[PDB]
Each structure stands twice: as C-alpha cells, then as structure tokens.
C-alpha cells in the first residue's frame, strides 16, 4: 500500500481502541522495525500487505518486503537525534550525545532518553539524517530510567 520513504507508527485494533505498539522506518521499499513490536507478524498498509523477510530475536530487528537496508553507524563522537514518535503524539527530534554499552562482543552506542514502550522502533539519526539504529531495546538503570541501545542491522 503506502511505500513512501519515512517514519511510520505500528498500530493494532486487537486491544481496546487503536493502540500504538511501536514505530518503523520505510526506506528503499523495506519496512524496518524491532522484532518485539510485531513478533514477526504480517503488517497491513492500507489495502496492501507487508510480509516479513528477515528477523532475529537476539538483534531484536525485523525487515518487511526485503533485506535490511539501513547501514549507517554512530561515529562515536557526535551528538545524534532520536526521531521519537510517541503514542498519540507528534513526531519530535531530540538531540543527545550517546553513551556506551560495553559488552563481551564489543561496544555499542546508547541513548538515555525516556519514552513509553510504544515508542519502540523510532529511528536514531546522524547529522545527515541517516538512520544509524533503532530505539527500543536496552536496560533499566538504578533510578528506574530507560537507556536504549543504538540497534543497527547488517546490510548484505
């Protein structure tokens, strides 16, 4: 149905009224979102149907209509922008300097912004407007706050 490049909300009518379960990025005909938002279920775009193509629970990512197209990465130094799309609220750019998730397999960028779980799948952008990762998978710190990783997929 709607194939236009841009940010999108992922909604469901299964619960009371229409509920926003997450967000995704449409780029080069591929819809990219976080696995925990759709669970690999097919999505509807008006009259049209989007079927899953690639998914991985550990990376917590899922692509529709084609392989993962997003390949930009955080440079480790610059401030980034979270294009947050909150449930029932307008899309908003929030600039921040990411922190670090130090893991046994390497370091990952981290955005310490706090949003409801329905904001999952919101794109993190670099200075050129390129999507460097998706917001929605991270950890809860001592003060109950949420710190998400900058989750990026691999472009084949």
């Amino acid at each position: 149905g709607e194939t236009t490049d841009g940010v999108y909300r992922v909604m469901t009518r299964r619960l009371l009224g229409s509920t926003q379960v997450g967000v995704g990025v449409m780029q080069e005909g591929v819809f990219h979102t976080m696995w925990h938002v759709t669970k690999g279920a097919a999505l509807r775009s008006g009259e049209g149907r989007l079927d899953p193509y690639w998914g991985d629970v550990k990376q917590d990512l899922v692509s529709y209509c084609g392989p993962w197209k997003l390949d930009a990465a955080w440079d480790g130094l610059s401030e980034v922008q979270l294009l947050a799309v909150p449930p029932g609220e307008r899309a908003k750019n929030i600039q921040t300097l990411p922190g670090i998730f130090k893991t046994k397999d390497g370091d990952i960028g981290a955005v310490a912004l706090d949003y409801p779980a329905g904001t999952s799948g919101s794109p993190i952008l670099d200075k050129c407007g390129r999507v460097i990762g998706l917001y929605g998978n991270g950890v809860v710190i001592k003060n109950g706050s949420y710190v998400s990783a900058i989750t990026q997929g691999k472009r084949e």
């Binding site: 925990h36 799309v85 921040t96 981290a110």
Partner: protein, 39 residues
C-alpha cells in the same frame, strides 16, 4: 491485526530540544535479545 500509518520524514532538525546524558554501562546480551546490567 497490525497496521502502519505514516508519521513523517526522516530529517535532522537543527535547533531541536537537546537533552539527555551519556552513561558508560557494563552490559550483557542474552540469547533472547534481553540486555542486562553487569556488576
């Protein structure tokens, strides 16, 4: 059944609200895609 509605363009907005800290945290990623704090 899930569906998508457009929310906007993907552009950098200059003069946007600059907030949030940069924490360096020791974390672990399990087989189920769950992050956890390591101490």
């Amino acid at each position: 059944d899930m569906y998508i509605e457009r929310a906007g363009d993907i552009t950098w907005e200059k003069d946007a609200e600059v907030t949030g800290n940069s924490p360096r945290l020791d974390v672990a990623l399990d087989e189920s895609g769950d992050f956890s704090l390591v101490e």
